[PDB]
């Protein structure tokens, strides 16, 4: 994790990720209107202020 925090059911998620055989990602298609999606912190540094 990059931002300071922790998961819950950490070992359960880790075991299902080890048994995953890799990750295939589908774009969930969530389009957000009325608000902004640009939140970032200095803890994550890709080219400066970034986030996930």
């Amino acid at each position, epitope marked *: 994790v990059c931002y300071p925090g922790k998961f819950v059911n950490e070992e359960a998620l880790r075991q299902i990720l080890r048994e995953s055989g890799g990750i295939d990602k589908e774009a*969930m*298609g*969530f*389009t*957000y*209107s*009325g608000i902004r999606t640009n939140g970032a912190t200095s803890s994550c540094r890709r080219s400066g202020s970034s986030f996930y």
Partner: antibody
Amino acid sequence: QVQLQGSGPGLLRPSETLSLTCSVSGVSINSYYWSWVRQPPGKALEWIGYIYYSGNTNYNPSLESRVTISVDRSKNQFSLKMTSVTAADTARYFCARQGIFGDYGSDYWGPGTLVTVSS
Amino acid sequence: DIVMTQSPLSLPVTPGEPASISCRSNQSLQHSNGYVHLDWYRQKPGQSPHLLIYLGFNRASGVPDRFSGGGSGTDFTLKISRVEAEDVGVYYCMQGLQTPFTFGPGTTVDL
């Protein structure tokens, strides 16, 4: 915020295969699955069918066989083709996405590609 | 095929009054989550429509305060608090439960 844009032939004779195209920005047919509608001229509006961005298709039991929705993964425009066109199907095709499939952000309905079916 | 029953037909509204249009079908409309799939549309003639209310009871994005219409069960009603000059346009209500999708006959509201 995606931007939808449609294009295609207007003066078309009946019976032959119809062509249509529709360009989008932003989502790039990579995340959400778009659908299709059809506008009778000053009559009741109805729905054509949805196509998953992957390619799975579903339609209206009013009309199945004549409609073929293009997938077009690589190019950033998804298209529509109709066979056996009719002067009763002289319509104002709209190109869009809808609330209820999972996205709750309006429709971003594309412009009206007006078509006329006459000899 | 779920045939959609709009009511009423047309609203010759006066400027500045609370108006309302109902919407019902021959089914109970409820999703598995508990959130009803009902939409409210607004098509200016000669131009693409717009959504004003989504998910039944819920305020939509980019939509100001005069539209928050709800209801109960399978008959819902869009409420319009103030009538102004730009409220002309044909209105549609729409389910989202299952295929197929049947739009409404239309509500030609005018002054």
